[PDB]
């Protein structure tokens, strides 16, 4: 190989996803306690909008 | 500082009873091996090594 082979380091993901047929990065978090669900999700979506 | 001391580990997974002398390196790039070759003359009076391995 080494004559017709040449090799290197670089990155790839160890694991990969898609969701409903698109690349998805799943993310898990929770409401800051004393915060009720949607409030977290609102700020999520909000944080997503930008 | 000198040329050249080659070692060996034979198919047994063991190094040949002793090392051997690297004679030279012929710099010609072998076309279909695309590979330099090293010819190292080795003492083989023990009648152990065989032409080709």
Residue with tokens 């409903």: A20
| Helix (H), strand (E) at residue A11 | none
Determine the Cα–Cα distance for residues A17 and A24; give it in Å rounded to an integer.
Answer: 6
Query: Which residues fall within 8 angstroms of residue A29, CB to CB, at 6 or more apart?
Result: A40, A44
Instruction: Please report the sign of the dihedral spanned by the C-alpha atoms of residue A20, residue A25, residue A26, residue A29.
Output: negative
C-alpha distances in Å from residue B7, one per residue of A26, B17, B42: 54, 10, 10
Mutate to test the interface with B, among A1, A2, A3 (most CBs of B within 10 A): A3
Determined by cryo-EM
Residue with tokens 């080659």: B6
Residue A38 has what DSSP assignment?
H
State whether B35 and A3 contact (CB < 8 Å): yes
Q: CA angle A44-A47-A49, nearest 5°?
A: 110
Q: In Å, how far is B34's CA from the nearest CA of chain A?
A: 6
Residue with tokens 């065989």: B50
- Two tokens at B28? 């010609």
């Amino acid at each position: 190989f080494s004559a017709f082979s040449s090799s290197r380091w670089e990155y790839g993901s160890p694991r990969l996803e898609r969701y409903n047929g698109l690349p998805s990065m799943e993310i898990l978090g929770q409401a800051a306690p004393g915060k009720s669900t949607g409030e977290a999700m609102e700020l999520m979506e909000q944080l997503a909008s930008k | 500082n000198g040329k050249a001391k080659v070692s060996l580990i034979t198919s047994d997974g063991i190094k040949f009873p002793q090392d051997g002398t690297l004679e030279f390196s012929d710099v010609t790039v072998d076309q279909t091996t695309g590979s330099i070759t090293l010819r190292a003359i080795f003492p083989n009076p023990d009648h152990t090594m065989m032409p080709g391995m």
